Chain A
């Protein structure tokens, strides 16, 4: 099962949020 691999679980966990509230 050697060879290239897609990005693994848990990597790059600081992704931009999908949703954001405007808070005051």
Chain B
């Protein structure tokens, strides 16, 4: 029983301790619903943390580390009970254990703690976890251990309120630059996800990732054989192109757009959607970035998805079309018209998502304003597909930004 285990674990004799801690570990590792709360309420935590100090019994340190790992794998309340028992400094000590199993289990426990949230992450960082963790990365490290190191690196990079300290990012990026050349799929997935958390952290963090030199190693993973790697890379580069035009151009200069036909035609609708989101952030750029999308032969594929994709993908394609009109030239917008954008675009005017309706009306207004003389040809195309009747109906929409624009479009372009 738990009472018994706690009684034995509190003994001064390390072999009685070992028996008890192994029994607790087995309770916590034998199925996917361990009795975490019962073990916390029993009072075992400070005892287990005390066991971590016993360099004279590495088996006891290992068992205690595995037990605490699994308690910390639970809810935030369970992880925080481990942290409140002073586990973190003792695990950081065990990163220097001569015993491989103890060191690896300490890494794993710290991963669960760091993963709980940003303040917990920042406590562990402040105590110096990053340097010894990255010191493990070597040619001789066993691959299972390296996979766990890289997973902890994800947890160091994630969570955004606040993001991890700049100095930590500066320490982690050279290690990610090494790991991105690994061939192991699990290492690559984690490495790229860690990068994607950094590129979502803000424009200064995007710039740090760019300045590391890693982007040309990241872009070709869009065509990796493993779909998990491809989509991690799509997130990582996608976050970069939420930045400035110059930051976006770093990604385009790696020929990123040549990787997109196989993502836009991918069987998985979620990948189509994610790919079109990326492209919508390209077409929001300057005229040269708009032209890059045209020259990669992607516009017909976007328009196909606008018409025949799943609704989630259609919404993204609507953004890609409207955003082109921000800085696109008259001739680039004319190309959209020639590619039969107007009917599937207008078909989104009636949906219940007011954000999409606004995007489409904004793009139609910009298209009409840009076609100085051709405004009548385009107006006729909008009328022909029922787009004009749909705009007239939007004069009765709930949302003022929508209905105002519907009145204005009809007054400016259909009141002759």
What is the interface of chain A, defined by CB distance below 8 A to chain B? 1-8, 10-24
Ordered by A's residue number, 14 sampled pairs between the chains whose C-beta atoms are within 8 Å are: A2-B326, A3-B323, A4-B242, A5-B242, A5-B281, A6-B242, A10-B312, A11-B273, A12-B235, A14-B231, A18-B158, A19-B79, A21-B29, A22-B105
Of B111-119, B163-171, B252-260, B333-341, the stretch lying at the interface with chain A is B111-119
Q: How far, in whole Å, are A3 and B251 apart by their CA atoms in the complex?
A: 18
How near does chain B come to A6, taking the closest CB pair, in angstroms? Answer: 6
Q: How far, in whole Å, are A19 and B212 apart by their CA atoms in the complex?
A: 28
B193 adjacent to A8 (CB under 8 Å)? no
**Is B382 on the interface with A (CB-CB < 8 A)?**
no
A13 — which chain B residues lie within 8 A by C-beta? Answer: 270
B342 — which chain A residues lie within 8 A by C-beta? Answer: none
Q: How far, in whole Å, are A12 and B271 apart by their CA atoms in the complex?
A: 9
Query: Which residue in chain A gives the minimum CB-CB distance to B231?
Result: A12
Q: How far, in whole Å, are A7 and B228 apart by their CA atoms in the complex?
A: 17
Q: Contact mask B96-119 → A, CB, 8 Å, 1/0? A: 000000000100100110011000
A24 adjacent to B235 (CB under 8 Å)? no
Given A2-B325, A2-B359, A6-B200; A20-B111 close (CB under 8 Å): yes
Q: How far, in whole Å, are A17 and B403 apart by their CA atoms in the complex?
A: 44
A22 adjacent to B326 (CB under 8 Å)? no
Which B residues from 304 to 322 make CB contacts under 8 A with A?
312, 319, 322
B270 adjacent to A21 (CB under 8 Å)? no
**Is B284 on the interface with A (CB-CB < 8 A)?**
yes
B32 — which chain A residues lie within 8 A by C-beta? Answer: 21, 23
Q: How far, in whole Å, are A11 and B196 apart by their CA atoms in the complex?
A: 13
A19 — which chain B residues lie within 8 A by C-beta? Answer: 72-74, 79, 111-112, 115-116
A11 — which chain B residues lie within 8 A by C-beta? Answer: 235, 270, 273-274, 277
A20 adjacent to B108 (CB under 8 Å)? yes
Given A4-B242, A7-B277; A16-B29 close (CB under 8 Å): no
Query: Which residue in chain B gives the minimum CB-CB distance to A17?
Result: B115
B73 adjacent to A20 (CB under 8 Å)? yes
Q: How far, in whole Å, are A5 and B5 apart by their CA atoms in the complex?
A: 54
**Is B280 on the interface with A (CB-CB < 8 A)?**
yes
B362 adjacent to A1 (CB under 8 Å)? yes
B359 adjacent to A1 (CB under 8 Å)? yes
Q: How far, in whole Å, are A11 and B235 apart by their CA atoms in the complex?
A: 9
B155 adjacent to A18 (CB under 8 Å)? yes
Query: Which residue in chain A gives the minimum CB-CB distance to B315?
Result: A8
**Is B331 on the interface with A (CB-CB < 8 A)?**
no
B79 — which chain A residues lie within 8 A by C-beta? Answer: 19
A22 adjacent to B66 (CB under 8 Å)? yes
Q: How far, in whole Å, are A11 and B276 apart by their CA atoms in the complex?
A: 12
Q: Contact mask B64-76 → A, CB, 8 Å, 1/0? A: 0010011011100
A1 adjacent to B358 (CB under 8 Å)? yes
A20 — which chain B residues lie within 8 A by C-beta? Answer: 73, 108, 111-112, 151
B398 — which chain A residues lie within 8 A by C-beta? Answer: none
B228 adjacent to A22 (CB under 8 Å)? no
Query: Which residue in chain B gives the minimum CB-CB distance to A8?
Result: B277
